Amino acid sequence: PFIYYDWKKTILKNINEIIPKTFFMELHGTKITNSTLNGTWKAWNLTDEGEGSHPVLKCIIDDGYLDMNFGASSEKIPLKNVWIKLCMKINPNSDGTYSIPEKSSSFYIKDNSLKISKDNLILDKYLNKLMLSYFKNNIKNIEMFINKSRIQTKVVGDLSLLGWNTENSVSFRTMNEFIKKDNLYPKDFKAVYSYRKMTFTATGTFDSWEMTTGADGRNIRFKCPIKSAAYDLDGDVFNSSTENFLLIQVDLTYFDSKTTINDPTGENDGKQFNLKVKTNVLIVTYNLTDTDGSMSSEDKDFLSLAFRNWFNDNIQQFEQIFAYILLDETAKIPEYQWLKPTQISYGSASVETANDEPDLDASIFSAMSMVENNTNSTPSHAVDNRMLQLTKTQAAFGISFPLFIEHFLKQALLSSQFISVDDIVADINTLTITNNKQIIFGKVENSDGKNVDSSLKPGKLKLSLQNNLIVLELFDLTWEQGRGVTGHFDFRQEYELTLESKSEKQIPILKVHDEPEIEYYVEEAQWKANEDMIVSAVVGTVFSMILGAGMKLAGSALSKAGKLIRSKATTIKGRKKIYINRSNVRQLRKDSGVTEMELQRINRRNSSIASEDARFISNNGTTSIQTLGDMKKKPMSTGQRIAIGVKKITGTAVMFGAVGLNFGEMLINYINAMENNDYSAIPGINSFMQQCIGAMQWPDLKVTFGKLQGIYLLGGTL
Fold this sequence. Notes:
Blueprint: E1 2-5, H1 7-11, E2 22-28, E3 34-51, E4 54-69, E5 74-78, E6 83-87, E7 91-92, E8 98-99, E9 108-112, H2 121-137, H3 139-147, E10 153-156, E11 166-171, H4 172-182, E12 188-195, E13 198-206, E14 210-212, E15 220-233, E16 236-239, E17 245-250, E18 252-257, E19 271-277, E20 282-287, H5 297-314, E21 323-327, E22 341-349, E23 364-371, H6 387-391, E24 395-400, H7 401-416, E25 424-427, E26 432-435, E27 439-445, E28 451-456, E29 461-466, E30 469-482, E31 485-502, E32 505-523, H8 524-547, H9 555-567, E33 569-572, E34 575-580, H10 582-592, H11 596-614, H12 625-633, H13 638-651, H14 654-657, H15 663-676, H16 686-693, E35 696-697, E36 702-708, E37 711-717
Antiparallel strand pairs: 1-10, 2-3, 3-4, 4-5, 4-6, 6-9, 7-8, 11-23, 11-24, 12-13, 13-15, 14-15, 15-16, 15-17, 17-20, 18-19, 19-21, 21-35, 22-23, 24-37, 25-26, 26-29, 27-28, 29-30, 30-31, 31-32, 32-34, 33-34, 36-37
Helix pairs in contact: 7-13, 8-9, 8-13, 9-10, 11-13, 11-15, 13-15
Keywords: Lipid-binding, Virulence
GO molecular function, one term: lipid binding
PDB class: lipid binding protein
């Protein structure tokens, strides 16, 4: 599971007794004889500037000073009301306390409120350095601060887009390959910091900048490795080692741009946005070391001020575009307008190995979107860190379950022609498409030879997502089975949306998952009066349900199914109930005596009928009430009506499987391909992938993973 950390909620439900009020730190050096930090605390409070397991702590100073003794003279800077922001990693333990590591990449100063020019970076540096040492020394007190902070955490059990409709994702390793090839980062530098006429200079060359781990959400972090460099510390010169780097941290933003990308799936009438570094650079930490290891830590302090200057002046030279997005674009095929972004953001999810080093394959860089002018009024930058771990692919695309049910399931039930568009309702809350009023399911010939309407109350027909499976449910399917008896049936079947290799292409197929489950119930009075008639009627109906056709069976098969029906008959609250579980279905299939050959003919015929009915589906996706009433009044077995509709429901996977190939003919193609096992004209999932990422492009996708798992998640290779 993924732990969501709701820092905004934590803030609105919040300790300082844990911290002694008076702080004091001292550091001896060479050029700086003595640095001294001394003051009193006003208040620590958690902020909502943190993301995931990286809260930000703001610590306001009541009064105090930083004094820097340069030997001859000194500088004493007042700290009244000055704040400092600390960022840390929190690791939950079993009992709901947290550990906090103290390595410099995880436990570091984000910012302070000290007012300084480019000359006085040295003041800023020593305030942060001495304060950070103080925080390390009070690590156990900070752990206690956190333990007592009543941190709000939602456990996210299955994969999530965290409020977003779509998400386009690549691994850090992939993004590092783009950065390197594009070669748009500053290679050479002359980094300078001057203070009191002392000058500190770094001159050399970077290797390719690498996106790395340790931050999350909007905070993007790069290792800038030094290839070689000469470090001139006010006349004293040191040559770098080959392990030297700076770890920096920036935000990105989407800049308006003239259209330069082509969207093959769109009209190219959007506004293009290029995702680039925002303008500046936090240096989180660094490895600066000379070939003789003689450099003091003071030497390294000054030197990092030179790079700080340089990164602040030159970050705009890192000209990488991390994402090209066409916003408010019209799609070429209007049935895929729902995949075109109307709001965007980005984010990342860092993942570490068991030994706490970067996992660049599991770590995710992400562009996210809302579609169809759905607004996200709380745009989180958090990204579920499990996606690429699961897909084991370098890239992926995600669609949220609410979007999936509004665009795929809604249509699939429409394609079934069990229900008209006037009667259909989508419930995002329960991931369910259902009927808003009573409907006729269809005409059936009852046990006394009379044609009667079978019907379903509001809410009783359901096509839904449950445990990552598509579930077709009919509850309380009612009709008069004979002799004035009113019978009631429940039917339930799970389907799985997998990818199958066909002609060496990956094809999205919706297929039965396990046996169905059928229940029947009747007034108890009627069961007593009319038992043997009810059993035979139940046997008939369960047989057509199981087999998908109301065909004549062996006289022996009906008495064999009759013993089983009877043996599951129980009583609840003035009604008799019969539950036919999954092994009961398997046993009933054997007792039917139906051969493999006859089942194929049943399916063939159901498929043909499905294709024939699908001609009455308009480009809209909908079928006319008069056509629906005609199909419905024609008497047929409950089982066969359900099975013909299922062919249309599974066929609606054409939406993922053969984009391009109107809707009615598209449907007929897939229904036909599934019946003949002929997908030579079928492109498969990659056709749908092209619709997803036409308007959301990387700096340059074959799909080999495609399941429901909290989100519809497509994973592949570029």
